[PDB]
Structure 1
Amino acid sequence: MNTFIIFIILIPIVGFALLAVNILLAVYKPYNEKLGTRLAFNAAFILVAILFLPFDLEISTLLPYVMSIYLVSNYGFTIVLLFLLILIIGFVYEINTNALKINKHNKPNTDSLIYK
């Protein structure tokens, strides 16, 4: 009965109304010419969304700390410092390995012109 839930139920009423208005209102009239295996992908594509999740789980692990920041003063501060640095080391692993690059397969072919 608050003004919070009329919103939750009323935004769909907005949408249901408008796509009704078009489906009820516009021409359908389709045909064949109007209508209409698998590819390979590089490793960094799947890598960005797989390694996305362990950083996201860290960001919501900071979320209990920054609400409790006064109560654990000088002590939970250092525990969080150690937590953050332990994960910064895995991040410097990740950017030292050049993991998230897609790198181009053709060079200028650097190898020189020798003879005989």
Structure 2
Amino acid sequence: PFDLEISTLLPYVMSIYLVSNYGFTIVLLFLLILIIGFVYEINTNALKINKHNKPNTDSLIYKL
């Protein structure tokens, strides 16, 4: 999808004059909508790798 976004941006850059100030605003709402999904991806932390053998951080407690 990010490749399809950046490839769909090609017509804008090659028609940028003829779509003066209208298609500008249109592509901004386009990019903002796509930035939303990027925001969802980051804050989920999808691309992060997760480790199983965790370092213990409990406390050492002795029953008396």
**Range class of TM-score, shorter chain:** over 0.9
- TM-score, normalised to structure 1, is 0.53
Q: 1:84 aligns with which of 24, 31, 34?
A: 31
Instruction: Provide, for residues 64-114 of structure 1, a one-character-per-residue CA deviation record: whole Å limited to 9, x for no partner.
Output: 110000000110000000000000000000000000111111221100100
Distance 2:53 2:42 in 1: 23
Higher relative contact order (CA 8 A, sep 6+): 1
Q: How many residues align?
A: 63
Distance 1:108 1:102 in 2: 16
Q: Using the TM superposition, give the Cα deviation of residue 56 of structure 1 relative to its aligned residue in structure 2, in angstroms.
A: 0.5
Distance 2:6 2:52 in 1: 35
Equivalent pairs: percent with the same residue? Answer: 100
Alignment of 1:62 with 2:16, yes or no, is no
Secondary structure of the residue that 1:89 maps to in structure 2?
Answer: helix
Distance 1:72 1:115 in 2: 73
Q: 62-71 vs 100-109, which deviates more?
A: 100-109
Report the aligned-residue RMSD.
Answer: 0.7
Structure 2 residue runs of 5 or longer lacking an equivalent are none
- TM-score, normalised to structure 2, is 0.94
- Structure with larger Rg: 1
Q: Which runs of 4+ in 1 moved over 3 A?
A: none
Structure 1 residue runs of 5 or longer lacking an equivalent are 1-53
Greater share of residues in strand: 2
Distance 1:65 1:106 in 2: 49
Distance 1:110 1:59 in 2: 44
